[PDB]
Every structure is written in C-alpha cells, then in structure tokens.
Amino acid sequence: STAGKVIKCKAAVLWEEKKPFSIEEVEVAPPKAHEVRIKMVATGICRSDDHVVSGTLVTPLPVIAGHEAAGIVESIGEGVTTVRPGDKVIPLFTPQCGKCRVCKHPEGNFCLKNDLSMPRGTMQDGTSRFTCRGKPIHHFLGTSTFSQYTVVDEISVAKIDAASPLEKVCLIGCGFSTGYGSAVKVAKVTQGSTCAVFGLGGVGLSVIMGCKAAGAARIIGVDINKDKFAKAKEVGATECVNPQDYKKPIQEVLTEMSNGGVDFSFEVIGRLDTMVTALSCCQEAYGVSVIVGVPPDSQNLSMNPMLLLSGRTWKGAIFGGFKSKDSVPKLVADFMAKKFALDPLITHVLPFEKINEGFDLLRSGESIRTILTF
Amino acid sequence: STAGKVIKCKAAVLWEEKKPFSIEEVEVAPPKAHEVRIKMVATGICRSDDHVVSGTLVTPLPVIAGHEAAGIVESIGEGVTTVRPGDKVIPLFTPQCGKCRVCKHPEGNFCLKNDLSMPRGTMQDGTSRFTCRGKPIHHFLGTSTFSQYTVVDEISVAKIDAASPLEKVCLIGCGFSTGYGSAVKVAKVTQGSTCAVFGLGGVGLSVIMGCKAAGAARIIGVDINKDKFAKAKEVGATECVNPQDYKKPIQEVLTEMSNGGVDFSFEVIGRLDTMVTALSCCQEAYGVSVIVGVPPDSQNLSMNPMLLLSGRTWKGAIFGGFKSKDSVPKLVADFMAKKFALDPLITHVLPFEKINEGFDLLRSGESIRTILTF
Ligand SMILES: NC(=O)C1=CN([C@@H]2O[C@H](COP(=O)(O)OP(=O)(O)OC[C@H]3O[C@@H](n4cnc5c(N)ncnc54)[C@H](O)[C@@H]3O)[C@@H](O)[C@H]2O)C=CC1
Ligand SMILES: NC(=O)C1=CN([C@@H]2O[C@H](COP(=O)(O)OP(=O)(O)OC[C@H]3O[C@@H](n4cnc5c(N)ncnc54)[C@H](O)[C@@H]3O)[C@@H](O)[C@H]2O)C=CC1
Ligand SMILES: OCc1ccc(Br)cc1
Ligand SMILES: OCc1ccc(Br)cc1
Numbered sequence: 001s002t003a004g005k006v007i008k009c010k011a012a013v014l015w016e017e018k019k020p021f022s023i024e025e026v027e028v029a030p031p032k033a034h035e036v037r038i039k040m041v042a043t044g045i046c047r048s049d050d051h052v053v054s055g056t057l058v059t060p061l062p063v064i065a066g067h068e069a070a071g072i073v074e075s076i077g078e079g080v081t082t083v084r085p086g087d088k089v090i091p092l093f094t095p096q097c098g099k100c101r102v103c104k105h106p107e108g109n110f111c112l113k114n115d116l117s118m119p120r121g122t123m124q125d126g127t128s129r130f131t132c133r134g135k136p137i138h139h140f141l142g143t144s145t146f147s148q149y150t151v152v153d154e155i156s157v158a159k160i161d162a163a164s165p166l167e168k169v170c171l172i173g174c175g176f177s178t179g180y181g182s183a184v185k186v187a188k189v190t191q192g193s194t195c196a197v198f199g200l201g202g203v204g205l206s207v208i209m210g211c212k213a214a215g216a217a218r219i220i221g222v223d224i225n226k227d228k229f230a231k232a233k234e235v236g237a238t239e240c241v242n243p244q245d246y247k248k249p250i251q252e253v254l255t256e257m258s259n260g261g262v263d264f265s266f267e268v269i270g271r272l273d274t275m276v277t278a279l280s281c282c283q284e285a286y287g288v289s290v291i292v293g294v295p296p297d298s299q300n301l302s303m304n305p306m307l308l309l310s311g312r313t314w315k316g317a318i319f320g321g322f323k324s325k326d327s328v329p330k331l332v333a334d335f336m337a338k339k340f341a342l343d344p345l346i347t348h349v350l351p352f353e354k355i356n357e358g359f360d361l362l363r364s365g366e367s368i369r370t371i372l373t374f
Numbered sequence: 375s376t377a378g379k380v381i382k383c384k385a386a387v388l389w390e391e392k393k394p395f396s397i398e399e400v401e402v403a404p405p406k407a408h409e410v411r412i413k414m415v416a417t418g419i420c421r422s423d424d425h426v427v428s429g430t431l432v433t434p435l436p437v438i439a440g441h442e443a444a445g446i447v448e449s450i451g452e453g454v455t456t457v458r459p460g461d462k463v464i465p466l467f468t469p470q471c472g473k474c475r476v477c478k479h480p481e482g483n484f485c486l487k488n489d490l491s492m493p494r495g496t497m498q499d500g501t502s503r504f505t506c507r508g509k510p511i512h513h514f515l516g517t518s519t520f521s522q523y524t525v526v527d528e529i530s531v532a533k534i535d536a537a538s539p540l541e542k543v544c545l546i547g548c549g550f551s552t553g554y555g556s557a558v559k560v561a562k563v564t565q566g567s568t569c570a571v572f573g574l575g576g577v578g579l580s581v582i583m584g585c586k587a588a589g590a591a592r593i594i595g596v597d598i599n600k601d602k603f604a605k606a607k608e609v610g611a612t613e614c615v616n617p618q619d620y621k622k623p624i625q626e627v628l629t630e631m632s633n634g635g636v637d638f639s640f641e642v643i644g645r646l647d648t649m650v651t652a653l654s655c656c657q658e659a660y661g662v663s664v665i666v667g668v669p670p671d672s673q674n675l676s677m678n679p680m681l682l683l684s685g686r687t688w689k690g691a692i693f694g695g696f697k698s699k700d701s702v703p704k705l706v707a708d709f710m711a712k713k714f715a716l717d718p719l720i721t722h723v724l725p726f727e728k729i730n731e732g733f734d735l736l737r738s739g740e741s742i743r744t745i746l747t748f
C-alpha cells in the first residue's frame with residue numbers, strides 16, 4: 001500500500017565528519033526500474049561505518065551510512081526478477097551484476113559496479129532516493145541501512161531464507177562473511193597450520209572462526225585491548241598476545257612463537273604498520289598474509305620488497321572474496337543448518353534510535369557487534 | 375691427479391665495488407666432508423652478478439662471484455653420496471638441504487641454509503676454500519662460478535645428465551629456471567590468460583617462455599630498450615610496449631590494452647617503481663603480480679594497500695619457486711627432450727678471460743646471456 005509512493009521515515013544522517021549521527025525525517029522515493037525498497041529489520045554497527053565518521057573512509061556527505069543489514073522487501077521497481085514484496089533480503093555492499101569481467105571470473109568478487117573504488121554515494125543511475133528538507137542525501141556503498149526504509153539496485157540485494165532470524169543474519173551482510181571468507185576462501189587456511197589474526201573485533205573473530213573451521217592447529221590473536229582475548233579464545237584462538245606487553249616488535253615475538261613464521265596472517269584492524277607487521281610475521285618462503293582492514297584514505301605504506309622475493313604471498317579482499325549475491329543466501333542456509341555461530345559476535349542489541357550509543361560502545365572498546373533493531 | 379691437493383687456477387676476483395674483475399691466480403682448497411670440488415665448463419653472466427659489482431646486491435668482498443654455471447666434479451669430500459668424480463653438475467645458488475621446515479613444505483624452495491637472506495660468503499662451515507694474494511676470498515651464494523675450479527657444499531649441487539651440453543644448460547642454474555618457474559610454478563599462469571612481462575633480459579624472456587608453455591592467449595613484453603622486442607616476439611610475446619613512447623603511465627596503457635588489467639604481471643628488472651607499476655597493471659579483483667627483479671639493498675617501496683584490498687595477489691620468488699636439487703636435473707632432462715629452448719637466450723659466447731667484455735655487453739644493453747667458457 002506504500003508501493004509506488006514516497007515514504008516519510010526516520011534515518012540516521014551524517015551531515016559532517018566527526019559529528020554524531022542525526023535522526024532526521026527523510027523522504028524515500030519509490031524504487032525505479034531494477035530497484036528494491038526494503039523495510040529494515042536489523043543493522044549491525046561495523047567499524048567501516050565509523051571510518052566514514054572519522055574521515056578514514058571518504059564518501060560524499062551528507063550520507064545515510066550502514067551496510068550490514070537485513071530487512072523485508074516493501075516493494076520492487078519495474079523489471080525486478082530476483083526478489084518480491086515480503087521477501088527477507090540482505091543488502092550487498094559489494095554488488096554482483098553477473099555481466100562484468102569480475103562477476104564472470106571464477107575467483108573475483110569485486111564487481112565493476114561497486115561504489116567503493118571511487119565512491120559517488122548514489123544509486124547506479126547516479127541519483128539519490130533520499131531527501132532531507134529538500135536536500136538530497138547520499139547513499140553509502142549502494143546499501144544505506146541506517147534508515148527505516150532504503151532503496152537498493154537489484155544487483156545489491158539477495159533473497160534469503162524466509163525463516164531466517166534477521167537480528168542475527170544481518171552479520172552475514174558484512175562482518176561474519178568478510179572474516180570467515182578471508183580465512184576459508186582468500187587465504188585458504190590449511191589443516192594443522194599456524195595462523196595469526198591482528199584485530200579481535202567482529203571481523204577478526206570471524207577470521208578465527210574461519211581458521212578453526214579450516215583445521216588450523218594454532219590461531220594466535222593479537223590485540224592491544226586484552227579485554228578482547230576471552231571471546232577470541234571462546235571462538236578458537238589457542239593464544240593471545242598484546243604487543244604493548246613486549247619490549248620488542250610483535251613480528252619478532254610471532255616469529256619466535258611460530259618457530260620461524262606463521263603459515264597465514266590476517267590484518268583485521270586498518271593500520272599501515274600492522275599490515276606490514278602481519279606480512280613480516282608470515283614464514284618468508286611460503287607464508288601468506290591477507291589484508292582485511294580498510295587503510296586510512298590516500299595513505300601509502302612503506303615495505304621492503306625482499307619480504308616478497310623470498311616467497312611470501314600478500315593479498316587483500318573485500319567481503320571475504322565471496323561473490324555476494326551467489327554466496328549470501330548459501331551462508332544464511334549454512335547458518336540455519338548450524339554450520340557456524342553468530343551469537344558470539346553480538347554483545348549489545350539496541351533500538352535504531354540509540355545508534356549513537358551503539359557507536360559510543362564500539363569506540364570505547366566495550367562492544368563487538370551492536371545490532372540496531374527496528 | 376688433483377684429488378686431495380690445493381689447486382692453483384685462474385679466477386675472476388672482485389676486490390672492490392664498481393671495479394673490473396681481476397683475473398688472477400687463486401688457491402682452491404680440496405673439499406672437506408660433504409663438499410664437492412667442480413671444474414667449471416661454462417658460466418653465464420646474470421644481472422645479479424652485476425648487482426654485486428654495483429653494490430645493489432650486498433655480499434662480503436672481496437668475492438668470487440658467478441652463480442649460473444655447469445661443470446664436472448673433480449673430487450668429493452668424505453661422506454658425499456649424491457655426486458661422483460666426473461659427474462656433470464650444476465651448482466645451486468638456492469640450496470636444498472632436504473631437512474628444514476621449508477625443504478619439507480610442498481610449496482617452499484627458499485631453504486633455510488641459503489646465503490641470500492643474511493650473506494656471509496662462506497661454505498656452510500663458515501670458512502672459505504679460496505685464497506688469493508695470501509688473503510681469504512669470499513664465496514657467493516655457496517656457488518662462486520667465476521673460477522676455473524670452485525668448492526660447493528653437497529646441498530648446493532645437482533648431478534645432471536651425463537650427455538647434457540654444459541655450454542647451454544648452465545642457464546638452468548639461474549636465469550632460465552627463475553623466469554620459467556616464475557610463470558609456471560609461482561604465478562601458475564592459466565590457459566587463455568593475458569600476461570605482462572616487465573624487462574626482456576634473459577630472465578624476462580624465460581618468463582615469456584613459461585607464459586607461452588602455460589597457454590597464455592596474450593603476452594605483453596615491456597621494456598624501455600625496443601632492441602629487446604624482436605627476441606621477445608620470437609619466444610612468445612604477442613605485443614611489446616616501450617613506456618617511453620606513451621604520455622600516460624604504462625600501468626594505465628596496460629590496463630586499457632587488457633580491457634581492465636592483466637591476469638598475471640611479472641617485475642623482471644629490479645626497480646622499486648616497476649614493482650608497484652606491475653602490481654597496478656594486474657586486474658584489481660583477481661590479478662596476480664610476481665616480483666622477480668632484485669631490488670636495491672635496504673630500500674623500501676611505497677604503495678597504496680587499496681591495490682591489494684580490491685583482491686590482487688602480490689608475491690615474489692627466488693629461482694622460479696623450484697626446489698633446486700629436485701628440479702634442476704628434471705629441467706635438464708626436459709631440455710634434452712627439447713621441452714623448452716635455451717639458444718634464444720644465448721647472444722654471445724666468450725672465453726672466461728674476457729669476463730669484463732662480458733659485463734660490458736650486459737651493461738650496454740647489447741646481450742641477453744653471454745656464456746663464458748673455461
Ligand atoms: N575488507 C572488507 O571487506 C572489510 C573490511 N573491514 C574493516 O575491517 C577492520 C575491522 O573491523 P571490525 O572488526 O568491525 O573493527 P573493530 O574496531 O571491532 O576491531 C578492530 C580491533 O583492532 C584492535 N586494534 C586497534 N589498533 C590496534 C593495534 N595497533 N594493534 C593491534 N590491535 C589493534 C582493536 O582493539 C579492536 O579490537 C576495519 O578496518 C574495518 O573497516 C570490515 C568489513 C569488511
Ligand atoms: N628472483 C630470482 O631468483 C632472480 C632474480 N634475478 C633478477 O632479475 C632481474 C633481471 O635479470 P636479467 O634478465 O638477467 O637482467 P637484464 O638486465 O638482462 O634485463 C633487465 C631488462 O629490464 C630492462 N629495463 C631496465 N629498466 C627498465 C624500465 N624502467 N622499464 C622497463 N624495462 C626496464 C632492461 O632494458 C633489460 O632489458 C634482475 O634484477 C636480476 O638480479 C635474476 C635471476 C634470479
Ligand atoms: O566494511 C565495509 C567496507 C569494506 C571495504 C571497504 Br574498502 C569499505 C567498506
Ligand atoms: O640471480 C641470483 C639471485 C637471485 C635472487 C637474489 Br635476492 C639474489 C641473487
């Protein structure tokens with residue numbers, strides 16, 4: 001009955017960097033051809049949304065952020081074939097158009113229609129479905145989930161299991177899938193290996209889940225916040241180290257612990273120095289290091305190419321290397337089948353209008369994932 | 375008739391950086407336990423030997439350099455089991471001890487007994503078998519092939535086919551195996567792919583041969599010396615580009631030519647800037663870039679980690695990823711069965727005594743490989 005009409009609803013608008021989110025009355029346009037309007041049910045607070053606030057991650061402002069979510073389709077634009085009204089869906093911050101060179105490649109997942117490489121903060125058609133007091137508000141990675149309703153391109157939404165618990169499976173829209181995929185698909189962690197995981201937030205915990213599932217014998221968590229260690233150990237870390245405890249660099253510590261370097265290292269923080277440390281701590285001849293952390297805007301790292309010439313492999317990935325539309329439904333089905341657990345990532349559940357409390361919890365170190373419910 | 379005796383013979387000693395080789399009389403000690411004394415038959419001039427002269431590659435001086443060679447066992451020390459006097463052999467600049475965690479790993483080839491990481495310029499026992507003007511002279515990578523006779527540890531030599539032509543198969547000791555392996559083993563180049571090869575010296579031409587053997591559709595040779603193009607085209611390059619002919623940076627040209635980036639790129643020069651350019655020109659979601667070139671001592675490159683976060687893989691390797699002692703005899707067997715060609719890499723043959731003309735041919739851009747004969 002809202003189909004074909006403007007919806008007036010509340011959304012959390014970020015007007016300016018380094019300011020609180022502002023709960024505003026917005027108008028959400030109806031979906032145009034090949035667009036889907038979604039009623040949000042749950043959205044997760046991911047450190048990448050905080051990067052927008054901090055200016056680490058540049059995207060046009062003002063913006064409705066939020067990219068880790070699950071909802072129900074309220075209506076569909078002309079030509080939509082992959083979802084219908086009433087369907088449970090997860091928005092895909094990495095699209096899967098199915099037609100570009102990457103979508104056709106067996107391994108690649110970074111679809112050329114993504115709004116990550118050179119963010120415009122629009123729909124695919126280069127316009128916005130959001131207005132606040134006459135002013136257009138930017139989209140974020142084609143998702144924009146910090147709103148009661150959003151509009152996404154059909155290539156940026158997957159239908160999921162009609163019985164799935166949206167307050168849990170929203171994590172499959174980013175943090176779980178990124179971390180788990182980084183281990184099982186990108187690194188391809190092997191049985192009996194030694195893994196080091198830098199950063200023990202939601203995404204690093206999911207890296208640990210991935211390494212345990214892949215049969216790693218040793219999984220060393222690294223965090224400057226020792227409060228993170230207990231939960232890292234619960235999901236499979238065999239050991240945890242705090243670099244602040246040591247009078248020498250942690251790559252030397254991890255090299256001695258691993259008897260000459262780890263098989264697999266993961267940077268899951270977003271700092272240039274830990275990207276180089278994670279590479280250095282993997283074994284010089286056959287080690288693999290995966291960058292998961294989003295670096296600070298426009299900054300270059302410095303590294304010695306002899307770390308690679310010896311044999312190391314260095315790679316990164318978006319969304320755990322998962323082809324998003326193909327994988328997100330299968331990951332939900334796997335969750336429904338008890339193949340992995342999401343409750344260990346969820347430390348707080350707040351109503352949407354307490355979003356700023358949700359971000360305060362993240363910034364303080366006290367949360368892993370806060371889920372915002374509608 | 376020389377067994378158990380000190381040999382007096384000619385060697386090319388490097389006394390000082392940025393000086394000509396000095397062809398003079400040296401004393402070569404007989405082999406100790408698990409050592410092998412070799413009469414050199416042929417040695418190639420590799421750019422890495424020139425890096426020792428220029429100080430780009432640091433190793434203790436004074437030194438007998440050379441690492442790409444073939445010869446005949448003159449005598450063996452006590453306990454040697456894998457070669458006998460009169461055997462044809464190729465010295466291994468990357469050893470294969472068979473005992474260490476790398477030698478036991480299925481992918482690893484950078485044996486922990488190597489003298490590359492932290493060069494000492496000795497035998498495994500920390501002493502030298504060379505005297506000149508009554509001074510001890512350093513070894514180079516446990517090989518030292520710029521001498522009529524050398525002594526190597528048993529883990530640094532492979533027995534090859536008794537009928538092999540040593541004046542060709544010396545190239546399997548470095549440049550051929552390194553390039554070819556970088557393509558077929560390290561990159562694992564796929565059928566129907568697009569490859570970019572930066573540098574069309576002996577190692578780059580070898581990378582092209584591996585790219586053609588792997589069934590690459592397109593192989594784009596890149597070099598600032600257009601005199602290199604003809605030979606590159608003969609051994610499988612489909613196109614050759616000189617960066618100096620374009621206004622745009624060559625990563626931009628290759629990305630255009632490949633309709634969004636190459637599948638596989640190779641840095642086969644040894645410059646920081648071309649290592650980053652080669653990484654950039656591989657497709658951002660699934661490209662693989664392999665560093666082969668030896669960078670200047672102790673220098674860091676600067677790069678944007680968003681190149682990796684999109685999904686690129688960056689790696690490097692020594693000796694094309696080959697387990698040296700397992701691989702080198704198989705590579706000689708494959709050569710004898712004409713599975714690959716070495717003649718295209720050999721542009722000049724000179725007597726050993728003309729080593730300095732050898733280096734001048736390389737430095738001028740005129741040669742690919744000069745083979746020195748003893
Ligand atoms: N590649 C991708 O597709 C994705 C990237 N990310 C990124 O992954 C990273 C992690 O995200 P979350 O787990 O949500 O963040 P989070 O902030 O919950 O976790 C980061 C952890 O790193 C630790 N840390 C900070 N500085 C450290 C240091 N110097 N040394 C060791 N530990 C340090 C913190 O104590 C914290 O526990 C972020 O950069 C985020 O933007 C998130 C999802 C998708
Ligand atoms: N990783 C390993 O195990 C091995 C490494 N190497 C290294 O591989 C590299 C190549 O060795 P070779 O083929 O013997 O050397 P080479 O000097 O014959 O060939 C290098 C080629 O690169 C070209 N070049 C120089 N600057 C260039 C630029 N800015 N752009 C494009 N091309 C440029 C030169 O014109 C030349 O044709 C060297 O750094 C050498 O030390 C060699 C053998 C083993
Ligand atoms: O967490 C979402 C996200 C992932 C990667 C980048 Br780059 C930006 C945002
Ligand atoms: O070409 C011989 C050699 C290869 C790699 C390095 Br590093 C140094 C020398």
Ligand SMILES: [Zn+2]
Pocket residue numbers: 095096097098099100101102103111112113
């Ligand atoms: Zn696509």
Ligand SMILES: [Zn+2]
Pocket residue numbers: 046047048049067068174175
């Ligand atoms: Zn996220």
Ligand SMILES: [Zn+2]
Pocket residue numbers: 469470471472473474475476477485486487
């Ligand atoms: Zn070894």
Ligand SMILES: [Zn+2]
Pocket residue numbers: 420421422423441442548549
């Ligand atoms: Zn060489």
